[PDB]
Design a protein that fits this description.
part of a larger assembly, 3 chains, A alpha/beta (355), B mainly alpha (39), C mainly alpha (46), B: mainly alpha, elongated, C: mainly alpha, binds zinc ion
Amino acid sequence: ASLVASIVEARKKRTAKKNITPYQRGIIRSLILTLDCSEAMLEKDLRPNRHAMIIQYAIDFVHEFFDQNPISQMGIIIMRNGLAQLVSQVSGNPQDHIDALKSIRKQEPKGNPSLQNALEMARGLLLPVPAHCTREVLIVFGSLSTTDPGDIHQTIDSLVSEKIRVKVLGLSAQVAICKELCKATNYGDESFYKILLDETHLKELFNEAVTPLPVNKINKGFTLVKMGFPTRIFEDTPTFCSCHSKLVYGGYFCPNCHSKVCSLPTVCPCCDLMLILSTHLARSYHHLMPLKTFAEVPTTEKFRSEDCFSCQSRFPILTSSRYRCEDCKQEFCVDCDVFIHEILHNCPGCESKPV
Amino acid sequence: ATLHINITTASDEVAQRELQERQAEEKRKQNAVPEWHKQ
Amino acid sequence: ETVINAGLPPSEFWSTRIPLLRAFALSTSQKVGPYNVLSTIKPVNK
Ligand SMILES: [Zn+2]
Ligand SMILES: [Zn+2]
Ligand SMILES: [Zn+2]
Ligand SMILES: [Zn+2]
């Protein structure tokens, strides 16, 4: 029954992944990362301490966030001494945010937290954000109390008016204001307040936030954004960059003003036109046409081949160790199913099948 | 009894940090292990 | 270089740097919340 217990647990896990509808997700995002650096973060529940582990996972989250959302922006805020301190402006450069996080790793956390001050700062940083970007705040709360100078309820109402979205990751237990902040801001949904139960769950929670948030049906902001695809150039002599005013051997050339840039994707410092490559947009295609989940094939029926269709692995001879895709009706091994829905985003059988 | 108050100005706080660093340095030098114990 | 000798108007120079101005103002425009101050004061003969 031990082996059966694992399989049913896998089936239960697959149950949540069976209902994959092509929800409309906002690929272009604008995130504000509010981290907590207060006396409550000096505890030892997370080895070595809450401050160290959160920063380490924040750096990993920054890396993953920009890898899967290349045309998004991020900012970082820290709650220290009852005030909100800005450590990184909204920008598309993953290195600037990582550099700020590393510097924060040295200073010891102290003082009391203030959600209102952090939220008010977030409201300002997200004010100069286009209407086609999803304004989001990912708060990592660690305290069980909040000391604020004003009425937190007024700020919550203001956030809803500006179409901002808030995700709160608590540490110890539920807090009433955080639940209201996440509920009144997410159109009544109560699934945006997550409390970790161990270190492993914490890694999953950050990794989950990397994916884009599905949009509501009544929140329509459809529009066309003027983008540009520059052509990389190879120059023999170094030239001054239009963004940092330094000498760089290479760089892309904008198609609107011919001014050069060092790295992509970034908005042109001259014409304020977003510059991206075809690859940057291709990274998000799997969020618009998600691959339909594979359904376990019952052992009652007969199978097609003894080996995997994609990896040519002998199916281990009770339960059928085969997963089939309804679109192409090709059996797959258990190992392939994980790699086809997480790393890859196309069913090899469907592509191989002619039409 | 006697109550002595000390108002800490922003500049005084910076000085206190400098004194703490100097105090830590002084203690560290005194606590250096002898030569015969190092190697 | 751009506003003193070149002659660019001051108003236009700050048009593209609104977030910088706002970020600088928010730093000194926020205050800590109310809290019992005399309770934390411990006198710790002198
Ligand atoms: Zn540059
Ligand atoms: Zn340009
Ligand atoms: Zn396989
Ligand atoms: Zn298929």
